Amino acid sequence: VANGHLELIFGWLPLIGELEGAIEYAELPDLDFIRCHGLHTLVLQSTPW
Amino acid sequence: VANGHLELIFGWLPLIGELEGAIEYAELPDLDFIRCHGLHTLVLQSTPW
């Protein structure tokens, strides 16, 4: 049983490395930019014709 | 007695012939063969879906 379990652990080892490498892919500081806009008006004067 | 025992042993002689023949028959070198099998396995991995 010991020889069968040690072999399985050894075979597991590389997948753990791949998963760890994938973990580092999540902490990459990358993003974009957000924008907004605002307007307002004020009627001044008016007259008929 | 000297003649009777001689006749008796001469009559016993032939039986020793077939007895030695059977003894030789018991030494005949013969035999058959034996053959077997076997199998060991090991799981690799698994994931959900």
Short mmCIF file of C-alpha atoms in Angstrom, two decimals:
data_model
loop_
_atom_site.label_atom_id
_atom_site.label_comp_id
_atom_site.label_asym_id
_atom_site.label_seq_id
_atom_site.Cartn_x
_atom_site.Cartn_y
_atom_site.Cartn_z
CA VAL A 1 0.00 0.00 0.00
CA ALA A 2 2.84 2.41 0.80
CA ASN A 3 4.50 1.99 -2.61
CA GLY A 4 1.13 2.51 -4.30
CA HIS A 5 0.33 5.67 -2.34
CA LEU A 6 3.79 7.25 -2.73
CA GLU A 7 3.58 6.79 -6.50
CA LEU A 8 0.17 8.48 -6.51
CA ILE A 9 1.54 11.42 -4.51
CA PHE A 10 4.46 11.75 -6.93
CA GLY A 11 2.02 11.73 -9.84
CA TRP A 12 -0.06 14.38 -8.08
CA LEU A 13 2.92 16.73 -7.58
CA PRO A 14 3.01 18.30 -11.09
CA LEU A 15 -0.70 19.14 -11.19
CA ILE A 16 -0.18 21.02 -7.92
CA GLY A 17 2.53 23.03 -9.66
CA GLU A 18 0.20 23.84 -12.54
CA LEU A 19 -2.52 24.92 -10.10
CA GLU A 20 -0.05 27.11 -8.21
CA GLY A 21 1.07 28.72 -11.46
CA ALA A 22 -2.58 29.37 -12.29
CA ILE A 23 -3.05 30.96 -8.85
CA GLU A 24 -0.37 33.56 -9.60
CA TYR A 25 -2.26 34.43 -12.80
CA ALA A 26 -5.11 35.89 -10.71
CA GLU A 27 -3.04 38.54 -8.88
CA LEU A 28 -1.85 40.44 -11.97
CA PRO A 29 -2.60 44.17 -11.46
CA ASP A 30 -4.40 44.90 -14.74
CA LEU A 31 -7.50 46.98 -15.44
CA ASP A 32 -8.95 49.89 -17.43
CA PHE A 33 -10.48 53.33 -16.84
CA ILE A 34 -13.99 54.60 -16.06
CA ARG A 35 -15.44 57.89 -17.27
CA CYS A 36 -18.47 60.08 -16.63
CA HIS A 37 -20.00 63.35 -17.81
CA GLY A 38 -22.33 66.01 -16.45
CA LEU A 39 -24.04 69.04 -18.00
CA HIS A 40 -26.44 71.80 -17.01
CA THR A 41 -28.12 74.79 -18.64
CA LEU A 42 -29.66 78.07 -17.51
CA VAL A 43 -32.08 80.11 -19.61
CA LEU A 44 -30.97 83.75 -19.75
CA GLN A 45 -33.55 85.95 -21.48
CA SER A 46 -36.19 85.89 -24.21
CA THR A 47 -38.40 88.33 -26.08
CA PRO A 48 -41.22 88.07 -28.65
CA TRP A 49 -40.99 89.30 -32.25
CA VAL B 1 15.57 -80.25 -1.37
CA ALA B 2 18.56 -79.29 -3.53
CA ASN B 3 16.46 -80.02 -6.63
CA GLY B 4 13.16 -78.68 -5.31
CA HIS B 5 14.51 -75.29 -4.30
CA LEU B 6 16.31 -74.99 -7.64
CA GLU B 7 13.10 -75.74 -9.53
CA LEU B 8 11.25 -73.24 -7.33
CA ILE B 9 13.74 -70.42 -7.94
CA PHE B 10 13.79 -71.19 -11.67
CA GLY B 11 10.01 -70.87 -11.66
CA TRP B 12 10.20 -67.63 -9.70
CA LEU B 13 12.71 -66.12 -12.16
CA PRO B 14 10.20 -65.09 -14.88
CA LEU B 15 8.10 -63.03 -12.45
CA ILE B 16 11.17 -60.94 -11.62
CA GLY B 17 11.29 -60.09 -15.33
CA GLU B 18 7.90 -58.38 -15.37
CA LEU B 19 8.62 -56.89 -11.94
CA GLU B 20 11.75 -55.18 -13.26
CA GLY B 21 9.79 -54.17 -16.35
CA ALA B 22 7.22 -52.43 -14.16
CA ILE B 23 10.03 -50.82 -12.15
CA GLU B 24 11.48 -49.41 -15.37
CA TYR B 25 7.99 -48.30 -16.41
CA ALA B 26 7.78 -46.31 -13.16
CA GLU B 27 10.91 -44.33 -14.12
CA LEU B 28 9.57 -43.10 -17.48
CA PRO B 29 10.28 -39.33 -17.57
CA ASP B 30 7.00 -37.62 -18.50
CA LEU B 31 5.19 -34.41 -17.53
CA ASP B 32 2.84 -31.59 -18.51
CA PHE B 33 2.89 -27.79 -18.21
CA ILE B 34 1.47 -25.07 -15.97
CA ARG B 35 0.54 -21.51 -16.85
CA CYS B 36 -0.87 -18.59 -14.88
CA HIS B 37 -1.93 -14.94 -15.07
CA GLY B 38 -1.96 -11.71 -13.08
CA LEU B 39 -3.02 -8.06 -13.18
CA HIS B 40 -2.40 -4.90 -11.14
CA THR B 41 -3.91 -1.46 -11.70
CA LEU B 42 -3.81 2.13 -10.44
CA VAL B 43 -6.20 5.09 -10.66
CA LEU B 44 -4.87 8.24 -12.35
CA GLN B 45 -7.22 11.16 -11.61
CA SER B 46 -10.81 12.39 -11.81
CA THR B 47 -12.82 15.63 -11.99
CA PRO B 48 -16.51 16.63 -11.76
CA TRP B 49 -18.71 17.91 -14.58
#
